[PDB]
Curated annotation (Swiss-Prot), chain B:
Physiological role: Promotes cell survival. Blocks dexamethasone-induced apoptosis. Mediates survival of postmitotic Sertoli cells by suppressing death-promoting activity of BAX.
Residue range from the parent sequence: 8 to 152 of 193
UniProt superkingdom: Eukaryota
Species whose genome carries this gene: Homo sapiens
Assigned GO CC terms: Bcl-2 family protein complex; cytosol; mitochondrial outer membrane; mitochondrion
Protein name in the entry: Bcl-2-like protein 2
Tissue: Expressed (at protein level) in a wide range of tissues with highest levels in brain, spinal cord, testis, pancreas, heart, spleen and mammary glands. Moderate levels found in thymus, ovary and small intestine. Not detected in salivary gland, muscle or liver. Also expressed in cell lines of myeloid, fibroblast and epithelial origin. Not detected in most lymphoid cell lines.
Length: 21, 145
């Protein structure tokens, strides 16, 4: 039910959120 | 910021980068402002990190005209589960641009304009309140540019 691509994009998104704050 | 211009710049930049488009139009040459330049640069870094961690993004997109909007919305809704942040917004732009690239690759160029509209719609209806509450795109440019 969870979208695998959405989770992958989210993972990298959260990596970037940390790095730049 | 004009949301429509931001989407057009980033997608156009990506389509040129991947060799699908050349010449006049949004995305051609340098970005018109620091916001566009910042989004281009972090988007490039994002797509590189994504490919290294998983695999190439535009090649897990399986695109048809009848399913594209549904799939765009499903992926985006999962991406933003728990709330937006700036990194997830970059993810969203990269995904939308990759959907456009894959549409051109699969000889469905008319989807490019549709996907851009869907991006603008999603930004203005799902993400606009968070963006404004968080200092707007000016804040993004300061953090990421």
């Amino acid at each position: 039910a969870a979208d695998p691509l959405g989770q992958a994009l989210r993972a990298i998104g959260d990596e970037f959120e940390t790095r730049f704050r | 910021p004009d949301t429509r211009a931001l989407v057009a710049d980033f997608v156009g930049y990506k389509l040129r980068q991947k060799g699908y488009v050349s010449g006049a139009g949004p995305g051609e040459g340098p970005a018109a402002d620091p916001l566009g330049q910042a989004l281009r640069a972090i988007g490039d870094e994002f797509e590189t990190r994504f490919r290294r961690t998983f695999s190439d993004l535009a090649a897990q997109l399986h695109v048809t005209p009848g399913s594209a909007q549904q799939r765009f919305t499903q992926v985006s809704d999962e991406l933003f589960q728990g709330g937006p942040n700036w990194g997830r917004l970059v993810a969203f732009f990269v995904f939308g641009a990759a959907l456009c690239a894959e549409s051109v690759n699969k000889e469905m160029e008319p989807l490019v304009g549709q996907v851009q509209e869907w991006m603008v719609e999603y930004l203005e209806t799902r993400l606009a309140d968070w963006i404004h509450s968080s200092g707007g795109w000016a804040e993004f440019t300061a953090l990421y540019g």
